[PDB]
Amino acid sequence: CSCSSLMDKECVYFCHLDIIW
């Protein structure tokens, strides 16, 4: 879990945020 900005969208799914492909 570590993205540039936690508010991003797909970069946010990488931190375990229910990725919705």
CA atoms within 13 A on the CB side of 15: 11
Q: How far is the first Cα of the chain from the last one, in angstroms, to the nearest whole number? A: 17
Q: Buried b vs exposed e over 1-21: b needs ≥16 C-beta within 10 Å?
A: eeeeeeeeeeebeeeeeeeee
This structure was determined by NMR
